[PDB]
Design a protein around this ligand. Structure first.
Ligand SMILES: COc1c(C)nc(CSc2nc3cc4c(cc3[nH]2)OCO4)c(C)c1C
Ligand SMILES: [Mg+2]
Ligand SMILES: [Zn+2]
Length: 313
């Protein structure tokens, strides 16, 4: 109980910043996460015995893929931590508990292939879940891990609070389906602009949590240029593998996934920053002012991609 996690001075300082990189030492990631749970939630939120067993079962059910891996899980959770810490008073005890656990679990058992590839392959998961295929799978896997003996980190919630937090984690994980993001942000954009946005309305909170999940999920574009640039290699390595597998099914993939069209990556990044990233962190900054540093970092990285195209790197 009186057992805190402590990080070295540089990590203790930099972990509080939105652009923190969790580093290349896999064995430190679990303690980094427990550290974030303790500061954000409390040392009491979770039985440390059961949290540590949950954290390790989650790690084991992430696969060895270039990008949708255990590092990504902890990275997305760190971005959620940074939002929760800069927005102390806006979130319930149940929301802070749920959202860190949601972020850690959001891509469980990812195989490194989009919903689109599962559908055309006619993968069994596409038969069980017609929309948000992988995201319904990630939540399924989260529930299964919570039901292993000794792994129910929520066991000291009342029946109602337990049902509330699983509902938070389910909407949070489904919202990481980027297909659902455009709609969610347009609605949040209208609601903010006509002044009808109301954080006491549960359906409004759900939308705002959804956008936080998209913001944390995309946080690779909010890092310092060299992390952003080196993460892009891992992102495209999965995409080009999927593109290869599309060709094996006799389907020309979209250029984003065609390793023969690497030359168009910088121009594709521009579209993506302009179409998804900048709009995402703009509406987030409007609803939650202290998350501005994510919008600033995103715009710096847009400028770095403009320079790549202009040949200056
Ligand atoms: C941060 O997350 C992402 C990052 C960094 N990048 C991307 C890729 S965005 C994107 N759209 C593209 C279109 C293209 C292309 C590369 C492209 N990259 O080559 C020719 O036509 C995604 C989809 C996510 C989700
Ligand atoms: Mg996902
Ligand atoms: Zn993700």
């Amino acid at each position: 109980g009186l057992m805190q996690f402590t990080l070295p001075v540089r990590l203790c300082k930099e972990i509080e910043l939105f652009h923190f990189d969790i580093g290349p030492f896999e064995n430190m990631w679990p303690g980094i996460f427990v550290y974030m749970v303790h500061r954000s939630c409390g040392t009491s939120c979770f039985e440390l015995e059961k949290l540590c067993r949950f954290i390790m079962s989650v790690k084991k059910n992430y696969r060895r893929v270039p990008y949708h891996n255990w590092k990504h899980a902890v990275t997305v959770a760190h971005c959620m931590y940074a939002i929760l810490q800069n927005n102390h008073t806006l979130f319930t005890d149940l929301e802070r508990k749920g959202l860190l656990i949601a972020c850690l679990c959001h891509d469980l058992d990812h195989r490194g292939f989009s919903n689109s590839y599962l559908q055309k392959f006619d993968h069994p998961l596409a038969a069980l879940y017609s929309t948000s295929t992988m995201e319904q799978h990630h939540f399924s896997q989260t529930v299964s891990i919570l039901q292993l003996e000794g792994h129910n980190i929520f066991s000291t919630l009342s029946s109602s609070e337990y049902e509330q937090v699983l509902e938070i984690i389910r909407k949070a994980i489904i919202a990481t389906d980027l297909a659902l993001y455009f709609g969610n942000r347009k609605q949040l954009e209208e609601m903010y602009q006509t002044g009808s946005l109301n954080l006491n309305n549960q359906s409004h909170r759900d939308r705002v949590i959804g956008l936080m999940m998209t913001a944390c999920d995309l946080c690779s574009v909010t890092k310092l240029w060299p992390v952003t640039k080196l993460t892009a290699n891992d992102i495209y390595a999965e995409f080009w593998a999927e593109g290869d597998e599309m060709k094996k099914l006799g389907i020309q993939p979209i250029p984003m996934m065609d390793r023969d069209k690497k030359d168009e990556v910088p121009q594709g990044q521009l579209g993506f920053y302009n179409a998804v990233a900048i709009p995402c962190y703009t509406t987030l900054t409007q609803i939650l002012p202290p998350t501005e540093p994510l919008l600033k970092a995103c715009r710096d990285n847009l400028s770095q991609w403009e320079k790549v195209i202009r040949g200056e790197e």
